[PDB]
Amino acid sequence: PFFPPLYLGGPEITTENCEREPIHIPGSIQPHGALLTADGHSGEVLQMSLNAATFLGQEPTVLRGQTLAALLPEQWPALQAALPPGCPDALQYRATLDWPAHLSLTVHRVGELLILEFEPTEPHALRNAMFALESAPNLRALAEVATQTVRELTGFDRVMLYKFAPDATGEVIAEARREGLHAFLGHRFPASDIPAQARALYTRHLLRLTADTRAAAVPLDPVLNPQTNAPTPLGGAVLRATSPMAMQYLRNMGVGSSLSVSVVVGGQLWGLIACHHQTPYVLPPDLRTTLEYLGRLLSLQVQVKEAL
Numbered sequence: 001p002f003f004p005p006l007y008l009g010g011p012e013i014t015t016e017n018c019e020r021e022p023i024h025i026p027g028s029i030q031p032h033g034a035l036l037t038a039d040g041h042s043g044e045v046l047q048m049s050l051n052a053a054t055f056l057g058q059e060p061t062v063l064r065g066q067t068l069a070a071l072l073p074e075q076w077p078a079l080q081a082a083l084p085p086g087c088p089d090a091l092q093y094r095a096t097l098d099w100p101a102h103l104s105l106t107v108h109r110v111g112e113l114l115i116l117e118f119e120p121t122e123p124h125a126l127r128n129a130m131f132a133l134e135s136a137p138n139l140r141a142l143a144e145v146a147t148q149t150v151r152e153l154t155g156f157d158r159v160m161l162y163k164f165a166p167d168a169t170g171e172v173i174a175e176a177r178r179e180g181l182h183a184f185l186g187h188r189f190p191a192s193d194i195p196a197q198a199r200a201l202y203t204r205h206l207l208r209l210t211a212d213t214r215a216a217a218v219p220l221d222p223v224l225n226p227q228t229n230a231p232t233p234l235g236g237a238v239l240r241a242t243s244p245m246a247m248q249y250l251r252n253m254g255v256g257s258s259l260s261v262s263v264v265v266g267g268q269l270w271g272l273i274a275c276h277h278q279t280p281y282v283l284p285p286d287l288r289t290t291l292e293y294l295g296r297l298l299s300l301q302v303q304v305k306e307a308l
């Protein structure tokens, strides 16, 4: 069972209990965006990331108790209709907000709570990218095409296809990398490097990232959902703070930015499209949506090719 989180008297995580870190409820976000939670009926703002002023122009204690009807009059009705009570928690409402300078708005529902993510935002290629994946004559060719295509889309210094063995050990079976980088191709890693609860989370929530592996997490306050007096589920929030233990591994690797997309075959975590940048790097929200779609196409092509 999960340890309590740090804000409920839980211990700091060590290599003795990697698998017990409740990574889905860090009660904090990454600083390149802002997060609000709001009542799924009233639209009352219940929780604020402490950096909410940077992106929304109001401090946490001023946003708290205001309604989305007031804060987002243009979107609040469509938001309500798009994410009704009982809808699946993977279902997203997406808008582009005009701000005095665009801001990408991503919302999902967890029970009676709306989770709002704000971050700055900036087809003939993508179609040939899809046909290129379809046209790979074997799994290795597919792996190479997938990593090259994602590297061209994103500009990431390294894109790997990280495949799980039945014992949950991991191997780099293909990679596209910048001139001068060490090869990881064929290198194998222990199961503990991506522990059991991360693997579980990655079967349901198919994309996660650390834009800056040195950035302190920004607290969500109040940290507990006032509805439940319990932690706010952030497994579906891309602005979710990353495991400190994971962040440290990346820093030691010389990685300033990390992003991965789940490859899911027959409802099991087959592997990851695993991306690194040496410098901190925010992949624009448009390019993430594209990478999500490519992971789903790649997941289907892997299932086929691997039967052969």
Ligand SMILES: *C/C=C1/C(=C/c2[nH]c(/C=C3[NH+]=C(/C=C4\NC(=O)C(C=C)=C4C)C(C)=C\3CCC(=O)O)c(CCC(=O)O)c2C)NC(=O)[C@H]1C
Pocket: 014, 015, 016, 017, 018, 019, 021, 023, 162, 170, 172, 184, 189, 192, 193, 194, 195, 198, 208, 209, 210, 241, 242, 243, 245, 246, 249, 258, 259, 260, 272, 274, 275
């Ligand atoms: C005692 C805890 C440990 C730990 C925890 C941990 N690791 C992750 C997530 C990831 N680890 C990855 C590992 C690798 N990336 C690479 O590039 C290579 C080798 C070339 C390896 C072995 C990957 C890809 C992930 C996924 C996230 C990402 O893409 O960066 C988590 C979950 C993090 C989160 O989602 O919040 C956790 C808790 N890792 C350890 O090594 C030990 C110390």
